[PDB]
Write a protein that binds this ligand. Structure first.
Ligand code: U5D
Ligand code: U5D
Ligand code: CO
Ligand code: CO
Lengths: 379, 379
């Protein structure tokens, strides 16, 4: 059931912004690890005396990495005379965020029809304002409201190239890496209490609800279910400590838990990412046991060949299924020092009309099944 | 002239420690960019609730990358009960350093015969104490005094594996990268005033002095001239602004300007590093013009073949010469967001007895010659 209750017109995920201590090193690591190209910059070389921002792209996926310069470089500026390309940026906020949470996502940005309208309607419906709408070079409008913790939901709307004041990266500095990643599928938050978090976000967006170990979760979705925002809370008092609780402890509270990146070919993406794990890229979760794949035949043997199923076995891919589609997924180890944010690589099969959003669900069946397999691998 | 006036027994450079916001991403970037292997760790997985520290090695070169965790993880600890493996570490100092300076070197560590003696003698001769000697697992002693800015000179001495509490990295996670880098040749500081900086450091170490555009410099050297510590000050009032002054402005004062890394084969090192520049590694300075290499024949045509000289031309290597040896060198672009720290790759030829330290000098002749070539390339 989809009541299509969005209080304003939402299009697609637009970008994800990481707040960093040093944007250059994080951006270069992520570029090599994920196969994303350096596409745009805003920094000292573009006249920005406030922050260094580097944009990586793979298909429609946009990762932005931002770090503050010394405040002394811009001490004479005021907001009317700022050289920042992202006017919501604040040195103090950025340093406070990074010292509190470590490397992580500051902004989940969605493209809307009218960012000023989205901001006004959101705050009229309970959103906590974070940065008011500002029109950039009469071309782009950006506004921000609080999402959870110190993460903001950023609205961006275009009258008619990332943002004004960004420059395209020199082609010599822009190597055309591509491991198959194409778009952001969903972005997941961890909170202490799911109920109040859901009521708040659904309250100001009109997003609707989309349809034992560790967590309770629920998913908020835009009208066409292309913007997907799951939220988790911990379940306390279990034998094994909730990884949601561990997240909240090491992150100093609520924040973004994972980004799920859709691949057009998850087998190629994982081959390429795993090649680079020990040479600067990303590590993956420990693989499921053979019993997990010895049980895939009964569960998805009509969607994947046995050659493809053991090709999932090589790469350690998990598979889950809903009533409408099938889901291939795998999780990285945490992206930085703290056991907080990680990445999920995903590919969805089914639900063709284009593919409808959330085809196959989010893999919650893989909790029971992966442990069931581990225990029956003890055998 | 070498008076051999060291006030305590100094052996070799031991390690360089970077203070980071996220040690994982900087370490992974540096590993791929420089061809250094992950060799040791101290972090949550080793029981360290205070800081994440990752050690990279190439030959005798040791780069350590350290970042703080949330203070809440260790709020119950006191110094007697600390889980930190580097007891001089302080959350507040580390965050203050990184917010002030950005990514950069906190510690230049040298191995000595007796770190407690070196500390006591140093402070008796004017060194500003930073961290008192502490014996680690009855095996290693570490002490720190101020060097310049917020950089410390760290003394480490061993009774008889990096530091206690560090663990060897799993071989699966330890890919054997090697681009030919073998040891730290020198470590260079930028200060506002050279005179007082030299008097201070030479005062407490007994290091001796080793023997127009932008700077004045001088080099302090240990008895066998294997520990080399050049220091630069800006020269003001020139047409082109001093890069030393630019450093001091963007760094918020004095600090480490560059690390010079000796290669056993600078041609292989540069081939490998340049292959990776646009795929997560390091960028290099713009190459000298053909006139620079069209003038190398007259200057070093008796040390390098014409095939090797144009092989310097391919890689953009600079060459300089003293009265005793020859020096091949090249400089990276800054290692992070700010125009502050960079790396030099070096190889020295001559002065065989082993090779004596500083063979060929430090390339100061390449200032005049590189511009002379650029202007006569205008031709
Ligand atoms: C992270 C995740 C998801 C997931 O994306 C997710 C949810 O957890 C809540 C709904 C929204 C959403 O996107 C689904 C299934 C998973 N299954 C397992 C076995 N693990 C896992 C747990 C320990 C160790 C290795 C993997 C996961 O992390 C895992
Ligand atoms: C950095 C450096 C050194 C050097 O290592 C160094 C000194 O500067 C002082 C003595 C101790 C020491 O180790 C030597 C020669 C150099 N020559 C040039 C042309 N440039 C340079 C300047 C602009 C743009 C591209 C290169 C340098 O940076 C440069
Ligand atoms: Co997910
Ligand atoms: Co040098």
């Amino acid at each position: 059931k989809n009541p299509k209750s969005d209080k304003f017109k939402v299009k697609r995920f637009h970008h994800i912004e990481f707040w960093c201590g040093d944007a250059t090193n994080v951006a270069r690591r992520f570029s090599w690890g994920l196969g994303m190209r350096f596409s745009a910059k805003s920094d000292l070389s573009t006249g920005n005396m406030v922050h260094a921002s580097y944009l990586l792209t793979s298909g429609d996926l946009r990762f932005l990495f931002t770090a503050p310069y010394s405040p002394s470089l811009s001490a004479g500026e005021i907001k009317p005379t700022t050289t920042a390309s992202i006017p919501s940026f604040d040195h103090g906020s950025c340093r406070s965020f990074f010292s509190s949470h470590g490397l992580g996502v500051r902004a989940v940005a969605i493209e809307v029809e009218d960012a000023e309208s989205a901001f006004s309607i959101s705050v009229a419906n309970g959103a906590i304002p974070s940065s008011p709408p500002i029109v950039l070079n009469e071309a782009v409008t950006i506004a921000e409201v609080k999402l959870y913790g110190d993460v903001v939901l950023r609205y961006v709307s275009y009258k008619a190239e990332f943002l004004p004041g960004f420059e395209r990266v020199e082609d010599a500095s822009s190597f055309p890496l591509d491991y198959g990643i194409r778009r952001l599928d969903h972005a997941v938050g961890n909170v202490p209490e799911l109920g109040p978090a859901l009521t708040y976000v659904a309250g100001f967006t009109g997003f609707h609800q989309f349809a034992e170990s560790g967590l309770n979760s629920a998913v908020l979705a835009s009208n066409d279910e292309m913007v997907l925002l799951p939220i988790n809370e911990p379940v306390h008092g279990t034998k094994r400590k909730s990884q949601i609780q561990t997240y909240l402890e090491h992150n100093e509270g609520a924040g973004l838990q994972h980004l799920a990146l859709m691949s057009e070919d998850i087998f190629r993406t994982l081959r390429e990412m795993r090649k680079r794990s020990s040479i600067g890229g990303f590590d993956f979760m420990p693989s499921p046991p053979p019993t997990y794949y010895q049980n895939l035949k009964k569960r998805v043997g009509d969607v994947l060949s046995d050659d493809q199923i053991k090709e999932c076995e090589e790469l350690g891919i998990l598979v889950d299924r809903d009533d409408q589609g099938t889901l291939l997924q795998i999780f990285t180890k945490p992206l930085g020092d703290r056991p907080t944010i990680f990445i999920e690589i995903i590919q969805r099969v089914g639900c063709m009309m284009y593919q409808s959003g959330g085809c196959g669900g989010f893999g919650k069946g893989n909790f029971s099944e992966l442990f069931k397999s581990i225990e029956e691998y003890e055998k």
